[PDB]
């Protein structure tokens, strides 16, 4: 009985995963837009805060390479609300 039930649970997991796979292309597309938008929001406000600084460049990469580098938490949510910062940092770790 355990062998049969465990084998159905493996078929029901594959079906559960294929629903995710069919959805990843849409979720990945949305995240790309969201992350780029959040970066530009910081970029626009980087100019505001530092438009009168002695010798500062706006949007200067700290990498000699020109390759795209995935932003870390500090760069995206740097100047957002604490509730939203807390949600994106420890929200999943703290979810019950």
């Amino acid at each position: 009985s355990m062998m049969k039930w465990n084998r159905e649970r493996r078929r029901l997991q594959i079906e559960d995963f294929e629903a995710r796979i069919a959805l990843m292309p849409l979720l990945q597309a949305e995240k790309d837009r969201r992350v780029l938008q959040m970066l530009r929001e910081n970029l626009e406000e980087e100019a505001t805060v530092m438009k009168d600084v002695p010798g500062w460049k706006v949007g200067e990469s700290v990498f000699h390479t020109t390759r795209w580098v995935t932003p870390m938490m500090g760069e995206l949510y740097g100047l957002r609300a604490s509730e939203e910062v807390l949600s994106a940092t420890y929200g999943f770790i703290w979810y019950t």
Binding site: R10, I14, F17, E18, I21, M24
Partner: protein
């Protein structure tokens, strides 16, 4: 032929716990090699898609990679449903 029987029946009357322990452990090490279903265990694990199946750029000479998920090419899990 007699010594084995004369020894198996001696421990069975004195160490039933150990006789069951070594017997049970002995099956754990032997059966997996004799089982005909051990190969299915591997096939099912390889069939679980933890990762996205990144598509392959089409160059023209690939009559083994389906163009659409429902095309007849590629691996088929018809063995897993019947199992």
């Amino acid at each position: 032929a007699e010594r084995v029987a004369a020894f198996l029946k001696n421990v069975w009357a004195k160490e039933p716990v150990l006789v069951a322990s070594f017997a049970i452990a002995g099956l754990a090490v032997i059966l997996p090699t004799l089982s005909p279903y051990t190969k299915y265990s591997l096939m099912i694990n390889r069939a679980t898609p933890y990762n996205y199946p990144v598509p392959l750029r089409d160059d023209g000479n690939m009559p083994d990679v389906p163009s659409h998920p429902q095309d007849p090419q590629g691996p088929s899990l018809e063995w897993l449903k019947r199992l």
